Amino acid sequence: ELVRKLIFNPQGDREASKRKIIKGNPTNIFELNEIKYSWAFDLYKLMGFTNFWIPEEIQMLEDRKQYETVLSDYEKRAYELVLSFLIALDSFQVDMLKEFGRMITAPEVEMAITAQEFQESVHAYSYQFILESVVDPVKADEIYNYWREDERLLERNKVIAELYNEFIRKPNEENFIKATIGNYILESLYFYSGFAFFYTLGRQGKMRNTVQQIKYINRDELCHVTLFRNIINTLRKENPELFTPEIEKWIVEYFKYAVNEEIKWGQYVTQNQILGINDVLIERYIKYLGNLRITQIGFDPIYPEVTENPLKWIDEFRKI
Amino acid sequence: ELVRKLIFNPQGDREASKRKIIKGNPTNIFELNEIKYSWAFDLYKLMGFTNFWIPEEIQMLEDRKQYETVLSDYEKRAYELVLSFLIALDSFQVDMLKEFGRMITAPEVEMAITAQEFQESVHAYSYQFILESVVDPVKADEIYNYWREDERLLERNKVIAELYNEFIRKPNEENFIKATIGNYILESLYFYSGFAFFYTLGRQGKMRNTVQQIKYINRDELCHVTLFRNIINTLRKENPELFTPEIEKWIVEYFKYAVNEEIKWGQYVTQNQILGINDVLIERYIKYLGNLRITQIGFDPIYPEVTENPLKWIDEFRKI
Ligand SMILES: [Fe+2]
Ligand SMILES: [Fe+2]
């Protein structure tokens, strides 16, 4: 049963060295003259100042034409599914990051979480500006609401909320670690069929305006995964009693389930009808990313057969 | 008993016109193609993009010298009290804004709240950079911790937390309106002895580096008051049953108490020892600001005798 810290605790520890990610005894004064977790303060600076971006400064002059006249029925179906789902993911994140931040007892980590919450809001703004820019108003409302029309998308949204809702209903230590892992998996995997698709359209000079918006979102998402990688690894060191064998088993199962679900979404979205990407590239890509992200929080590769990034070329294409 | 909305509500209203500030039935998808509250989306744009600022881009080359050699014992005492208290206020705000945002049921308002929470984090960063820049490390730790040494400052912090803690412990509709009014009063009044002091030092070319940081903070705080003015006025229209006569009476009492407390702090901090400001200017200034802010949420002036801004010259000095 994780207690939400009071606004001010005059019995709080003065010594930054006594900070904990959770269940610390902070004053809740942001005593940032001393930093226990330098990675959190660095990530705040990076997300908040270094990587600041304004969606509306990205010119959108071309995509409405290419959407109107150059995209296939299949390219438009994928555009709609991917953007609908990304809108849902960042909506869930702006809201759930408030739950993580209010339970965190280390100010520099709370600070990094606030910056991430703001970046998720910038993404929501970017999607509204992409759609205002590219499609007609009824079609924009349709893309926002596409879960009402597509059972696969509706179920994706409901599964993501489940893991977050359990912590909210039942805010205990177990439900916190599971929500924390779920957040890491969402930002590790759930963007990446969508990012791979956009960069595919973009490599053939299709929807490059939309693709520019995506490059800024992807940079943000790499910082978000780095923040949660550090939080999880620090939670293991500081609260080992919470990484029971039941929890360690669950993490590997959920990661494998999430890899498989992201692959199927990618396949559903593209259906081998998208030139330059196919169902097998999608499979090895999501398995590559799963191995990378689960190893980085202290587990063995989950797809030993996959060792290479099948889409190595994205690392370079996505750069700004 | 205000229920925190689930991460995703497939029974949610599609129609933006059905949004409420509180107790709406949202999907919790940020459907920003349609905006019920244009003031909230405008304020998001202003706080998030238009008024973006980087504390560390403000050069701090002069203030360490003037602090070292040019400031009186009284000027240094005030610098320390004001900055200690502002550090406390923005710490409380980054943390409490997560509580408002998770209860808000209108996405554009949640979006504006997220931007405000990020601005409070930028302020915390600014204070750390001001102190790293101007004073030695033990003195910086002393300023962060000055509530441990000064009973008036300790009690100021404890009173601010009280009103927020009651909502957190007992999250009902009454405690929400009281916390919402308390937030408006904090950003209306609790900065303004501190801002008046800094602009006084600055008008005589003292601590102008610190004063530049303050101008950016003050611009932010005017946007924060505008956001809460709109939220309160909209809550009155949408939930009139919550503005009982017991609540309306309480708002006028608390505003009057807060005006009087801010004046006393201002007086305590300056003690008529600060050249260009005195105990009577402070009195009329905080009463002017109280009238302005309580009238703007639908009440009669609380100090009828005060009609003019005794420090009219700040309106112009503070501009960027
Ligand atoms: Fe993210
Ligand atoms: Fe503020």
Residue numbers in the entry:
A (entry chain A), B (entry chain A): 8 to 229, 576 to 673
The authors write:
pmcThe enzyme ribonucleotide reductase (RNR) synthesizes the deoxyribonucleotides needed for DNA synthesis from their corresponding ribonucleotide precursors. Class I RNRs are composed of two proteins, a large α-subunit (R1) and a smaller β-subunit (R2) that exist as homodimers, that combine to form an active heterotetramer. We present the first structures of the A. aeolicus R1 and R2 (AaR1 and AaR2, respectively) proteins as well as the biophysical and biochemical characterization of active and inactive A. aeolicus RNR.
We expressed, purified, and determined the X-ray crystal structures of two AaR2 proteins: one in which the DNA sequence of the expressed protein lacked the intein (AaR2) and a second in which the nascent protein still included the intein sequence (AaR2_genomic). We crystallized the mature AaR2 and AaR2_genomic proteins and determined the X-ray crystal structures to resolutions of 1.73 and 2.10 Å, respectively. Superposition of AaR2 with AaR2_genomic shows the overall structures are virtually identical, with a low RMSD value of 0.15 Å. Analysis of the AaR2 di-iron site showed clear electron density for only one iron atom (termed Fe1), which was built in with an occupancy of 0.9. Fe1 is coordinated by three carboxylates (Glu127, Glu194, and Glu228), a histidine residue (His231), and one ordered water molecule. Comparison of the AaR2 di-iron site with that of AaR2_genomic shows that the iron-coordinating residues occupy identical positions, with the exception of residues Glu194 and Glu127, which display alternate conformations in the AaR2 structure. However, it was evident that the presence of the intein in the construct seemed to influence the occupancy of the iron, particularly the Fe2 site, which had 25% occupancy in the AaR2_genomic structure but was empty in AaR2. The low tyrosyl radical content of AaR2 (0.05 Y•/AaR2) is likely the result of the low occupancy of iron in the active site.
